[PDB]
Amino acid sequence: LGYDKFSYSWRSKKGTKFHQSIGKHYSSGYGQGDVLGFYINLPEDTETAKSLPDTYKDKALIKFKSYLYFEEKDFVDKAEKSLKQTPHSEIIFYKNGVNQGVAYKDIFEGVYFPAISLYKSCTVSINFGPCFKYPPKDLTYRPMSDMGWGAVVEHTLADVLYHVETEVDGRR
Amino acid sequence: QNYPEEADGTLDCISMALTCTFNRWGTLLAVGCNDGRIVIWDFLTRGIAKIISAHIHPVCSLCWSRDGHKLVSASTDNIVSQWDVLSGDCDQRFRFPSPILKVQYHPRDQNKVLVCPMKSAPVMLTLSDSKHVVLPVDDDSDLNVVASFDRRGEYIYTGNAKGKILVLKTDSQDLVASFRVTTGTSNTTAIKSIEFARKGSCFLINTADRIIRVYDGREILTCGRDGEPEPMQKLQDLVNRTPWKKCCFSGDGEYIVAGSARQHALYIWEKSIGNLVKILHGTRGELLLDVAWHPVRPIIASISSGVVSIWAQNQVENWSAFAPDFKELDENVEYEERESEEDEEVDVTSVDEELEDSKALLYLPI
Amino acid sequence: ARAEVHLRKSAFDMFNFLASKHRQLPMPMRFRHLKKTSKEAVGVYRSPIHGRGLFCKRNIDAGEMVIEYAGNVIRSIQTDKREKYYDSKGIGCYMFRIDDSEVVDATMHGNAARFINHSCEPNCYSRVINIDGQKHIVIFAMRKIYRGEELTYDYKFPIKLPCNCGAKKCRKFLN
Amino acid sequence: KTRSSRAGLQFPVGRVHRLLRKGNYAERVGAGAPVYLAAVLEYLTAEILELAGNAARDNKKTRIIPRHLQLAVRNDEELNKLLGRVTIAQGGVLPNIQSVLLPKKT
Amino acid sequence: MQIFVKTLTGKTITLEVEPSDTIENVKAKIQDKEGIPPDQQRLIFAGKQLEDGRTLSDYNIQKESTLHLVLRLRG
Amino acid sequence: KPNYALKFTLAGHTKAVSSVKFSPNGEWLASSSADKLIKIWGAYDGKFEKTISGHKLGISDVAWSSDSNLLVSASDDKTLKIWDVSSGKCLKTLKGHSNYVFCCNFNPQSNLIVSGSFDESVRIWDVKTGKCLKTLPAHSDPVSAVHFNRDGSLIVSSSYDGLCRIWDTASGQCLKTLIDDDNPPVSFVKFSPNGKYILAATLDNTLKLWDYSKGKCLKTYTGHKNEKYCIFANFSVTGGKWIVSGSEDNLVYIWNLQTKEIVQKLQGHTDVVISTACHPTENIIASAALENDKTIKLWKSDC
Numbered sequence A: 001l002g003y004d005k006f007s008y009s010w011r012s013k014k015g016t017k018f019h020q021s022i023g024k025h026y027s028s029g030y031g032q033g034d035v036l037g038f039y040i041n042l043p044e045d046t047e048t049a050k051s052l053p054d055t056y057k058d059k060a061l062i063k064f065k066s067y068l069y070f071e072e073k074d075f076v077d078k079a080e081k082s083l084k085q086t087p088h089s090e091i092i093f094y095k096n097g098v099n100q101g102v103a104y105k106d107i108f109e110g111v112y113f114p115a116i117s118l119y120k121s122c123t124v125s126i127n128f129g130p131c132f133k134y135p136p137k138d139l140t141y142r143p144m145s146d147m148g149w150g151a152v153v154e155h156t157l158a159d160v161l162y163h164v165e166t167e168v169d170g171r172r
Numbered sequence B: 001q002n003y004p005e006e007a008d009g010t011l012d013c014i015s016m017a018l019t020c021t022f023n024r025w026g027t028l029l030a031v032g033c034n035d036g037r038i039v040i041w042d043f044l045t046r047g048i049a050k051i052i053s054a055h056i057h058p059v060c061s062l063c064w065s066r067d068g069h070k071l072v073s074a075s076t077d078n079i080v081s082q083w084d085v086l087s088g089d090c091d092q093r094f095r096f097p098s099p100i101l102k103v104q105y106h107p108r109d110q111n112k113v114l115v116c117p118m119k120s121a122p123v124m125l126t127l128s129d130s131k132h133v134v135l136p137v138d139d140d141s142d143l144n145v146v147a148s149f150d151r152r153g154e155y156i157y158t159g160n161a162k163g164k165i166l167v168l169k170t171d172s173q174d175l176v177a178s179f180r181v182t183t184g185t186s187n188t189t190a191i192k193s194i195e196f197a198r199k200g201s202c203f204l205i206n207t208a209d210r211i212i213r214v215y216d217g218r219e220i221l222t223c224g225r226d227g228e229p230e231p232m233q234k235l236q237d238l239v240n241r242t243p244w245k246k247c248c249f250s251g252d253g254e255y256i257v258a259g260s261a262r263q264h265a266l267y268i269w270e271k272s273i274g275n276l277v278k279i280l281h282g283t284r285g286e287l288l289l290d291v292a293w294h295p296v297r298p299i300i301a302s303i304s305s306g307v308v309s310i311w312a313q314n315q316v317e318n319w320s321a322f323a324p325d326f327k328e329l330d331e332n333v334e335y336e337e338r339e340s341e342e343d344e345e346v347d348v349t350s351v352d353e354e355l356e357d358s359k360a361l362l363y364l365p366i
Numbered sequence C: 001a002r003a004e005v006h007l008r009k010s011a012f013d014m015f016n017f018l019a020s021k022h023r024q025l026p027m028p029m030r031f032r033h034l035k036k037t038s039k040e041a042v043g044v045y046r047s048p049i050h051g052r053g054l055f056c057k058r059n060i061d062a063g064e065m066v067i068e069y070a071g072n073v074i075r076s077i078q079t080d081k082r083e084k085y086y087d088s089k090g091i092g093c094y095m096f097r098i099d100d101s102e103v104v105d106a107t108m109h110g111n112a113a114r115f116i117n118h119s120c121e122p123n124c125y126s127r128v129i130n131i132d133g134q135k136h137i138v139i140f141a142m143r144k145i146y147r148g149e150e151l152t153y154d155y156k157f158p159i160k161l162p163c164n165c166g167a168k169k170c171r172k173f174l175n
Numbered sequence D: 001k002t003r004s005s006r007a008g009l010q011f012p013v014g015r016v017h018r019l020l021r022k023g024n025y026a027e028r029v030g031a032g033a034p035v036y037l038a039a040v041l042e043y044l045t046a047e048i049l050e051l052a053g054n055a056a057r058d059n060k061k062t063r064i065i066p067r068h069l070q071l072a073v074r075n076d077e078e079l080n081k082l083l084g085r086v087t088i089a090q091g092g093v094l095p096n097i098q099s100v101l102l103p104k105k106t
Numbered sequence E: 001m002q003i004f005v006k007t008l009t010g011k012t013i014t015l016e017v018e019p020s021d022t023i024e025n026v027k028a029k030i031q032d033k034e035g036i037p038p039d040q041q042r043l044i045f046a047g048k049q050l051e052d053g054r055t056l057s058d059y060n061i062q063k064e065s066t067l068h069l070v071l072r073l074r075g
Numbered sequence F: 001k002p003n004y005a006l007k008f009t010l011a012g013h014t015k016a017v018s019s020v021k022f023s024p025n026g027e028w029l030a031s032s033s034a035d036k037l038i039k040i041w042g043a044y045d046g047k048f049e050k051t052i053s054g055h056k057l058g059i060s061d062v063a064w065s066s067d068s069n070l071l072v073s074a075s076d077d078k079t080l081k082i083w084d085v086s087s088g089k090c091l092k093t094l095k096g097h098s099n100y101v102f103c104c105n106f107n108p109q110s111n112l113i114v115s116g117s118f119d120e121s122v123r124i125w126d127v128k129t130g131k132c133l134k135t136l137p138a139h140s141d142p143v144s145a146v147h148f149n150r151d152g153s154l155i156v157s158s159s160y161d162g163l164c165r166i167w168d169t170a171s172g173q174c175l176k177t178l179i180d181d182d183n184p185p186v187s188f189v190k191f192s193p194n195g196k197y198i199l200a201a202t203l204d205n206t207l208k209l210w211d212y213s214k215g216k217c218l219k220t221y222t223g224h225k226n227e228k229y230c231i232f233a234n235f236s237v238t239g240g241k242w243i244v245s246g247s248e249d250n251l252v253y254i255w256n257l258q259t260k261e262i263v264q265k266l267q268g269h270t271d272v273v274i275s276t277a278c279h280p281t282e283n284i285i286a287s288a289a290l291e292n293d294k295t296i297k298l299w300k301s302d303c
């Protein structure tokens, strides 16, 4: 985390900020029983660039042995060269409200995924959403594990969701 | 570390080799050849130092001086001579009425050598004025007595040939302590010899009741004139009944080693627990003469029948010692990478325990 | 002669053992032979093909399991930093890729089989088995080993590090 | 008071002495004979059972079937020298095929 | 009171013995102190016999005295 | 200030005086050239003693023992000999090297002898007889300079690679392999009395001092020229705190332990200073140079 501009990190040990294999002694460390707050400060609408693939043959569909798999793959050397900056470009590594300061700035312009980076065997619990502290604001992270007709209709909806493009595409 | 676990070959610079002893930490070997000559071999370096034309009749024992400048030899022809380590000639020459068993130098008094005459009291010969001082003994004066220093040589202990052990001072000769060995169940027992260590003041006693015993050089002056025998462990061999000839103490102060005569059974124990730990596998056919470990490092080296057999710990450093940041090991786990990625004007000038048995000053590179 | 500077200065050598002498049944339970009876049949000596090598003082015929190769098994992300450190310290391409997802690095940890060479006229071929749920690479011979020869296996690289062995069929390259 | 713990062995010593006394092997025996026999039987039993356990964990089965004992005794060479003319009930035989009888083709 | 128990290696240990505490309890305290089993130890006062199933007052040993703890074997 | 003023200019050799060594006893100088001659000269007076000969080709390195009794010379006739200082005869033979002998020194314990040639290895021989003992691979390049430690247990091995190594004498395998990424060719190394530091005269215009305790680069000693030739070095603790080393700008230069200062520049030799020797009990320095100098300058001093 931080090795590339795509990823941003704040080290848990000694609080030494690290990015692109470059380290500066910046803050204090964290760890056991330390809840890391995270509120990416973009309450206002922004603009980013999402998709720009460079390969196509690796994006194919064929039976493996008894089931299909969707080869939806990313690339690297092309994606890194489309790197751009965007609004609210700051991945701040809070400490549950209290913040030591954003370690690194000028984050990559694109869809944001909160990455949790581990280095050895260690467990960690999560709570993400458009809320503040309590997980149950929206539907409490439904797993969609039920036998009723709701599962049937949602599965058929997803089937159609991909069926539209598998019909309008045209298979080689 | 632990007891020696590997085996070494022989060290025969010349065909014959009768006696051997280490100086302080196994520097040079004092071979008394059975031809009237005194040869010095090199230990830990596998060489020779000096050959001395002592006299005609061969010798049977050897020891070196406290300052390392003398080569005392209990001769078989009563030549009590002080051969020089440096030049090889004789410094002091004297004759004793009885031959000598055990020669030693007090690490604090090289003037008074250790002599064990037979059928007569031990005699300290002073090298400063060639004067003989008889050690006062008790009861008989015609017994096979053996005299030996303590760790520091501050008290001298003598063993007789009826069951009596005497304690006196190495220089003042104030015989104020005696001891009577146990009389078995019906019959008494004499003493063959005693042998000391360099730490702990313990000492083994070899007697004629076929059993090796152990005492400490602190319970006789504490008890007074004479008390009741009370050994720690009456060690013995109860499957073959091998007699005992020569046995020394450990190079660490916690082990005990005992030697056979012809059975090639070299036994070892520890002072904490009297349980056998290992036995030596020797090839039958020869008689053991001398045993003495490395006074610091665990190893065994026994001389016998002109040759020497060493059971040792042969060691060569692992290939993974190229550099502290370089290792040659094997693992099946994913690599754990790193997680943390003056001006002064001073010249440079800086360049068991230890006793005083040093300064041999004998080394000839050419 | 202390007054003329001789060439061939840079070496980048690690295993400083180069000398001019070089004086050389079911599956799962065969694990013992790997660790106990596998330390005499092969000696380490100066290879004639290139660099150091594993010469032979014993004989091993066809279809005989010989050595298990072990080293620092890592994922493919560490390959970038590993290659950078190879360029820095002057480290050869020890990227032993058992598969495209796991590679057996041999620059910080490895076994005695780090001493092997490559040639288009080798003596043995590679093989891999699975014991106790773990995939391990063990080599089975096709011919007999003579006294005084070096183990070498074809890398099977489909057709710039040259392969200087001197064999007539030697393609002079890893291909 | 017991007697096996005097040497720390596990095989009984009083039983061995009684059985050797009533076995009329001789008329008078010493004291070290029973302990020595208990010790050597201990060593041999440990030698066999360690390989038995190794073979048990070979096939990942807790119980040791006699096939495991047969394999452990036969594969070793010193045992085969000492257990020369002896068979085992239900023992079976170790796999073996003669070298020259191995067909092959391109 | 207090007495000395001298060992074989040469280390000196000072311990406290009550006037009305039996020797067996002293040995148990020693065993729980440094781990040496009572079967590996016995008391000797200046080359004179001392047993385990007794009490210090039965022997009437003076204070600040040394006892030769001549080493034994397990069992 | 080091006031090393010249007193004697010595020139007896023919080809090139490129090896002069002040032995630890500092009694006589064993001047050598590439003309199979070993001339014994004075130290405080420069008196001519003799010229021991017997070899067939030039010498690459000369050394005397702690007591300056043995004399090792890197004769390129596939053999080496020890020449008696008292008489001047061949004591023992050092046969075994398969090519030109380039490095050879002694042990402060006066019990071991080290030599090296173009067989990617170094060797030792018995002092009493002179037979083959070991063939320890030093590096993959011909070895320029080696020497035992003052405690007689380690050797510092230098070849033209750059990866400086410390080899254990008790086992024959390297202990610390201080690896340089740039891999700068090395010319000479010398043990410190404490046996913790080493001065590897790298051929990159810098005396890269190495500390093999942890594997960290030390300060950068500059102020000279060091690119091609086998530049040696020595200490000087009598008058002050100085470390003398050769330079390829044809001049003799001295620095400090960890200050990186040009404390003294001895001038007068017309060729590249290939060797520097400092007297043990006096502030006397003799520097050997290449073909264009052929002179030995005794820079005597007192403080």
Ligand SMILES: Nc1ncnc2c1ncn2[C@@H]1O[C@H](CSCC[C@H](N)C(=O)O)[C@@H](O)[C@H]1O
Pocket (backbone or CB within 6 Å): C047, C049, C050, C051, C052, C053, C092, C093, C094, C095, C114, C115, C116, C117, C118, C119, C161, C162, C163, C164, C165
């Ligand atoms: N003959 C050869 N010439 C050049 N490189 C070789 C080679 N044989 C193997 N290699 C390369 O060297 C790498 C292993 S390191 C070589 C083995 C060891 N260092 C030695 O001294 O022999 C392999 O990745 C292989 O690609």
Ligand SMILES: [Zn+2]
Pocket (backbone or CB within 6 Å): C163, C164, C165, C166, C167, C168, C169, C170, C171, C172
């Ligand atoms: Zn080829």
